[PDB]
Paper text:
The Tol-Pal system is essential for maintaining outer membrane (OM) stability during cell division in Gram-negative bacteria. The inner membrane complex TolQRA harnesses proton motive force (PMF) to establish transient interactions within the periplasm, thereby coordinating cell envelope remodeling and facilitating OM invagination at division sites. TolQ forms a pentameric structure similar to that of MotA and ExbB, exhibiting a volcano-like configuration with a narrow periplasmic end and a wider cytoplasmic base. The pentameric TolQ encapsulates the dimeric TolR through its N-terminal transmembrane helices at the periplasmic end.
To explore the dynamic motion of the TolQRA complex, we aimed to capture its distinct states using styrene-maleic acid (SMA) polymers. Two distinct structural classes with high resolutions were determined at 2.92 and 3.28 Å, respectively, with one class lacking density for TolA (hereafter TolQ5R2) and the other displaying density corresponding to one copy of TolA (hereafter TolQ5R2A). The TolA molecule bound in TolQ5R2A is positioned consistently with its location on the TolQ1 subunit in the nanodisc TolQ5R2A3 structure. The superimposition of the TolQ5R2 and TolQ5R2A structures onto the TolQ5R2A3 structure shows root-mean-square deviation (RMSD) values of 1.31 and 2.52 Å, respectively, based on the alignment of 217 Cα atoms. When viewed from the cytoplasmic side of the pentamer, TolQ5R2A3 features an oval-shaped cytoplasmic opening, TolQ5R2 presents a round opening, and TolQ5R2A displays a split between TolQ1 and TolQ5 as well as between TolQ3 and TolQ4.
Residue numbers in the entry:
A (entry chain F), B (entry chain G): 14 to 38
C (entry chain A), D (entry chain E): 5 to 221
E (entry chain B), F (entry chain D), G (entry chain C): 5 to 223
H (entry chain H): 7 to 35
Write the structure that this text describes.
Amino acid sequence: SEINIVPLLDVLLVLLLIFMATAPI
Amino acid sequence: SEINIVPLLDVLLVLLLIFMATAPI
Amino acid sequence: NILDLFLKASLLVKLIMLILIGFSIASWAIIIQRTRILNAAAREAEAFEDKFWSGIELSRLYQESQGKRDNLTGSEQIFYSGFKEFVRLHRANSHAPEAVVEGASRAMRISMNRELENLETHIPFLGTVGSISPYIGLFGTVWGIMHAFIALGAVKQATLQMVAPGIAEALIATAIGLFAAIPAVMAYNRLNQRVNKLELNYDNFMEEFTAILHRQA
Amino acid sequence: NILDLFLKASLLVKLIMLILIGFSIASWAIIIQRTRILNAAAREAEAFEDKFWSGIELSRLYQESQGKRDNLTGSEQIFYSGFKEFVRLHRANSHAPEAVVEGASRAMRISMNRELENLETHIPFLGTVGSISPYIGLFGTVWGIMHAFIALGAVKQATLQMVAPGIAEALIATAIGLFAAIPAVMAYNRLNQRVNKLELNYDNFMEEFTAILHRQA
Amino acid sequence: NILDLFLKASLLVKLIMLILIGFSIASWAIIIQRTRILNAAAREAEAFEDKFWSGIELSRLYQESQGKRDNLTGSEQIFYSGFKEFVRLHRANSHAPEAVVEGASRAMRISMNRELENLETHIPFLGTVGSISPYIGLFGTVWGIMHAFIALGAVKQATLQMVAPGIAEALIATAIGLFAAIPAVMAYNRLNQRVNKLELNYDNFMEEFTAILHRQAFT
Amino acid sequence: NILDLFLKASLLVKLIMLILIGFSIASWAIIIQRTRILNAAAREAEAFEDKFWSGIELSRLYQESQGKRDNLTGSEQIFYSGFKEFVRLHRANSHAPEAVVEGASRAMRISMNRELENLETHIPFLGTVGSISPYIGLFGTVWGIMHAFIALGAVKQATLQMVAPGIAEALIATAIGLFAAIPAVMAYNRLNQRVNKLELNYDNFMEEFTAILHRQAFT
Amino acid sequence: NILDLFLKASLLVKLIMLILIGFSIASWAIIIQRTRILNAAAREAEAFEDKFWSGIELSRLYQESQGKRDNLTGSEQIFYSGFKEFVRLHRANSHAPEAVVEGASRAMRISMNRELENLETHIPFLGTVGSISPYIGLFGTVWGIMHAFIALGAVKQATLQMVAPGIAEALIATAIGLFAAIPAVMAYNRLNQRVNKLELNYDNFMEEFTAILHRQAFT
Amino acid sequence: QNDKLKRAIIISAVLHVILFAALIWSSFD
């Protein structure tokens, strides 16, 4: 068949939005 | 047609690795 | 819990959630109907094929078939069509065995194609749902991220605590998309396999019947 | 607020975002436009096919078509072209009616190809937009991060805390790119699938009319 | 390490991991079991072709053929069916040799279809695993990330040390899902290509035998 | 800025950048040449059909085509080939007024295929560039990051100032790759569209001419 | 460089690297052999195409081709498979000139399909390698990232030393995946283009010879 | 053809403008 990993982009974007502001407490 | 995915995932993962490696927390 | 998250969402997010929920309900209903229909068809075909080789003459089989010829389906319908066409071609037009064989084959093919078309339906809708569902969820997540940035820019605070509420709806959209996606694909594959098995059984029966008919003539 | 963060971003990021928004507007305009034309064509073809089987004399239908000879579209034009070719070639002392039938089929095929080419315009722009859109956003993000690190390494007084908004502005580019990409990709497949159905309907009507014309000669 | 995260994970994560492991085990068993049968069939077909093209009279090899009644497979059963149908229908009706050839060909096609449909079991099960597993892994990851960040937002103090293990427990799911997904599709693509070779060999043998029968019918 | 990081890069990064720049130059040259060639072909094709429907006697058009045999390209070549084949077949013998249609169709089809093959040179190279360009950029970036982090361990105290330039030097490769990738994918589709439209026009001309010759063939 | 971090890597990384290296070696060998085979085929086809219009009578060419019997490749097999067929069909049925052309066309098409199938081999393997290679690198990267997150969540206020293994493993996996992926795609595209060119040349020759045959059979 | 395309462009542009304005206003709250 085929391997579709389409919904993984949301996970990576969400993670990238967090390390930016993770330094402040 | 078709939204190629492999380049986007690789670029985002490399960015995440860069951000992780530069954090001394 | 879920109600608060649904209420806090934006307008487009609510529309997307409603669309996905409707898709889920429709897919479940289609699966529920098709499973029963296919199981009944398989049971009837197996029973009739078991009855055939019991030693019953074709004449009395045809006599019994005309009693419920209005509701004859599947293998019974194929047998009725084949015998009727064979009888008609024997006493009408040319009587060459090649013509009779060709006519019987054409009639059986037409009946089998009609029955197979009858059995499989509403499956392409399941395939389309499975193919399209994740993209709408990704669209909703992207819109939610844009909304979160705009709201964060509206206020002067840059703390991750303010950013945190901007992720719940975006993740909920993707969760609903996957939840709608999985059963459609599973049912699609299973139903296709069952239909292929039924088609193979029908083809074997029609080839055996054609071989039987061609031998006597 | 939003304007402050927009101005803080470099010129290239803003330019890319404006380009993507314009692309989205154009794509939605085309998608909205084509649907009305396709639906009108479908309903007109169905209505004309329905009227043709009512038993009206073919001469009356030909007169009705001739009344608006310059305003015939869809299934109407094919009928007029075929009838004109059939009648005109019939007065040319054609000994073999098979030649007349072949000529009528040829003229009908020419007109059908012209009409389909007329219907199938303006579509591939959507495919190009869907194929190109994500790369521009990814390039914008890469450029933003590159310049952010260059500025950080140029002056030792800088810190990631100060550079933080630039990375968010960079990620907005990828968000907007996917936002513009997805709907065009879906609509391309939808519209091609819809055009295929009209192609099939025209083909079957062509075959029926050719058979009817041939049987009367 | 990994075991600690598995123990400390939520019930849904554990259930997802168990489902994925079960799918992987079933796929490996099916692949291993199905690989040997095709090789055995190919070797038997080649040996039978070598025996057939050895110049031995067909009568002797047919007298040896009936010994394994209801035990033949591959080209042996196909040949037996075709030859028996040809002989019976020729000794019954001699009106038309072309009818004899046609009946032989019909019996041959029936037997070939039965053999190929026997050789192609449990292969379609592999496609479902490859199509489904990443979706389950991603669902687990999404649920885990959502729960972890909700718990993080429950506290006004933000630090990534507290919420670091949750993301690892989330990513284990997609790792296992993709690990189970890859070999299934990789082997599904390869197994299908082997059936076509046996189909081609059977078709070539069928054409050769039909030609021989057509030659012998007019005698 | 860019030049300094280009010079400071290692051997592999410089080779990758040189290859990418060469691909970009080749792509631009191919686009520029093919645009003009296709525009000229389209203009000639549009202009010829205007003369064809004017109402000039066929003998005059044939003699005009004969006078310029050296410069016969495009639609007029199809007309010449078809008319020559028709004349030869009629001169051979006047029997069977149906074979002339097939012969003329064959003669026109051969020339149409030759010309359409001629107009489509050097286009498939662009798709290769569009498909391959990003991967090489990622390769360069990952190698640069690996080299930077390997060299980072040499010093004892860790500061982001030392490691800052290497990351930008790595990202330059990805930027160049995407910049080379976009135009090729943009141009491929447009060139294909123009070729398809030309093919449709030639098919229309062939059908019209076949109808004309068929009508003229029978009294 | 590679060796040090490979030693620092885990067992899964070693297995992945071994698999991908084997894939790369197989791909390189296939490319090297196939390029030479196709170059030889192309030069032979060009030579035969040049020879066909040397003014030699067809009978002499047929007699020369009879010297190699059935050991013919390139466009030479097309002439032999079809000239004799046309001659024998014309001899058997001289009252149906419109059927010998159909038979010759069918035979030539079948022979061309046979030759085309012969010239394409082991290309789907390259396609499979190109399609599957990136996902194994994705799995390696996911494993590395989850390991790094575990390390971060293990000890508070971690140093840059203990986060090295995950990043190293992830980068190695990505680099090796891309390295195995690129040549397969490039060779796939190039070989497909060359095969298409050869098919076009064969089609042109078949059309020309069929036109010659139809011209001959007209009288 | 051109008039329909222009009308579609106008309606799409105004729809996008109002959608973005509504999104911006809603995000303020």
